[model samples]
Target: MNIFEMLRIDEGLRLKIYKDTEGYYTIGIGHLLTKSPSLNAAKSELDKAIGRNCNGVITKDEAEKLFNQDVDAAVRGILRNAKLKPVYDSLDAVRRCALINMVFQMGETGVAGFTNSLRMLQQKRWDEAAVNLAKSRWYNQTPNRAKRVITTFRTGDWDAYKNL
Candidate 1:
């Protein structure tokens, strides 16, 4: 899928990060103010937290500050890595966005760390990717959201998680 199509900047512009969550910055989405940070912010913060460079360099303290400059730009760069987008595409847009939303909070490494899942996505095996999607610590922490994404991906439809 076109990485452009997969990464949609939503309206949630609020932000979130733990008091001790260093070098990471994030934006909260929708009613996420009532919940966590928004998706776009999540993606950017994750990138910064992982020490991924923007324009080739960033200090340990710059990630969060960079995210504050423009999270949408950071997210575009992160998604540019097709290494992450393939897994996102295995699902319909809303479901895919939901995962991307979660990913924004977790970073691609959260997904990349799951070697089996990455292998399934790179292989174009949607079923396996769906299974792998549900097998994360994030999945455990956010069970309802994760389940909806996996189920939506499996069904290849957007209805299961449209509100997400």
Candidate 2:
């Protein structure tokens, strides 16, 4: 399901997401955001979402759960920061959603690593944005899936990669 499909929320759903905070999974309704259920559930979601765990811990499923929450939080954070005139307004919601997912999985450090792409996107420069998207460490890191995402970002076509 995509962001709209999953969240079914109207506003500020991005920053309202959850963060693991704890390694193990436990039940908790992510603060000011979606209902996380429990810690174990969180871990499971995280693992599935990012394909890894936080700090080298948790089962793959658990990691996906936590990854889910992180994504929730990251999207919320981006929306909150990009409120009013959302930086995303320049791009398709789907593409932005994809970018937010990648950024969330990667974290600020990971997102920041894409200096050129970020610059182009921020400036609403499509050509450079596409170029940066196609040739960046992000795509190299997560190749297959990431490649598709970058292509989506480049063409301003989010349909290919919606949902977080």
Candidate 3:
């Protein structure tokens, strides 16, 4: 599966507004309304897009649209990083998705902070990359998702996430 599908699973869908792990107002597959220019403006846009009051709820189609937009932004954000662009280019699809997944969960900046892990990934040192990832607060805060991402990095095998 592509990164979009993988993230849909990893991030989990929410049709209604809810508080995310960091207590930010979020909706539609982790879209942070709090990050908008204004929360009301974001909600208004969603309401217009869905052609309804929306209030706190959105349709599945709208959620999917928001998810795609968020993923695109994440991909672009990662590619904008000079060091990560080359490393991202050198990886296989599976490993590439692993990096994107990390970027999706954490931001491009957060992923960039994994200096040693990025170096290991660039050098194709799968074991070292996995180890570096395991040592992070990201791993500690969300062990299950981190483990899955780390496994993908370590193995560079679609089989590692086939059943996910």
Candidate 4:
């Protein structure tokens, strides 16, 4: 696998920070915020870390590099949650993306509370997983976006929501 294609598979192309599906203050491709530190106020934390001026707008090239590091850390944190791993690993890439997407939005510990959803996903019950996802608070808060993810899980079509 090409090192970079993975981000496309998950995050797509984002050139600026925007509130994500769960509304975290995010930047680059999918970098979530965790803290505030001593500021070299003129430069952004991301800019300082990468030595690039990405205060508001980031280039795809820069996002790609930052994306890998940030996404890897996020995924690593999710994987570290022992209860989520076995069920999480049972999914195919299509469904896996859904799980990872939820984990990214709701967070590792947060997504863990979706007991029924995880069970259905672990059993490869796509339809049930879709239903469970739709009935979720996440779905309630973001139905339009949730519809896309639900359709992806239910139909196993990666681009199920592409036209939207």
Q: What is the C-alpha RMSD of each candidate to the true structure, in Å?
A: 10.0, 10.4, 2.7, 4.1
What ranking of all candidate models by lDDT puts the best one first?
Answer: 3, 4, 2, 1
| Candidate 4 lDDT over residue span 1-164, tens digit each | 22234335445566665655555455666665433332333236657656867666777677777766765765787688887888767767666666666676567888888888878878889887787778777788867656766776787665654563
Clashes of 1: 8
Give the distance in Å from residue 152's predicted Cα in candidate 1 to where it truly belongs. Answer: 2.9
Please, what is the TM-score per model?
Answer: 0.48, 0.50, 0.87, 0.72
Residue 75 in candidate 2, Cα distance off native in Å: 1.4
User: What is candidate 3's lDDT per residue for 1-164, written digit by digit as tens?
Assistant: 77887787777888987777766678888777765545676677667656789987888888988888888988898789986798899898889999998888778888888888898899999997898789988888888878888998898776656787
CA lDDT of each prediction against the hidden true structure: 0.50, 0.52, 0.82, 0.66
Give the better candidate number (2 or 4) by TM-score: 4
TM-score-wise, the better of 2 and 3 is 3
Backbone collision count in every prediction? 8, 31, 0, 0
Best-to-worst ranking by TM-score: 3, 4, 2, 1
* Model 3 misplaced regions, further than 4 Å: 35-52
Tens-place lDDT per residue, model 1, 130-163, is: 8777777767865765676566555656655455
Clashes of 4: 0
Alpha-carbon lDDT of model 3: 0.82
